[PDB]
Each structure stands twice: as C-alpha cells, then as structure tokens.
C-alpha cells in the first residue's frame, strides 16, 4: 500500500512537470528568437551588405 501511493504521487507530478517544461520551452524559444534578431540587429556597422548577411 505504500508504493501503491508512491506510484500515483509520482505520476501526478510527472504529468504536471511535463506541461511545465513545455511552458519553459515556449518561453525559451521566443527568447532565443529575440536574442537572435538582436544579435542580427547591431550588424549595421557595415553598409547594406552587412545588414543582409546578418
């Protein structure tokens, strides 16, 4: 009966933390988008060539 409860207890936590890591992932992807387009933002020290190659 002890491990019978331990099973369900771990299961609910698993199901919660799956979606919580999913939320972490979606918060992470757009962060990486912002960081990428921000690293590509300051490439204007060159002319129009440095823009499009960035």
């Amino acid at each position: 009966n002890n491990a019978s409860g331990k099973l369900l207890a771990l299961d609910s936590q698993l199901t919660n933390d799956f979606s919580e890591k999913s939320s972490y992932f979606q918060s992470q992807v757009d962060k990486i988008r912002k960081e990428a387009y921000a690293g590509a933002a300051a490439g204007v020290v060159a002319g129009p060539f440095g823009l499009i190659i960035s």
Partner: peptide, 26 residues
C-alpha cells in the same frame, strides 16, 4: 595605422554593443 583603426573599431563595436544592451534591457 590600419591595424590601429581596426583595433579602435573593435572597441567601438564593443561599446556600441554595451550601450545597445543597456538600452534594450530597459
């Protein structure tokens, strides 16, 4: 001198990155 102006352009882009980060984080 070409060495020196590329040397100074490095610290130029460094400080521009510093200022751009300090602005964009705000």
């Amino acid at each position: 001198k070409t060495v020196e102006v590329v040397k100074n352009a490095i610290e130029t882009a460094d400080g521009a990155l510093d200022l751009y980060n300090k602005y964009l984080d705000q």
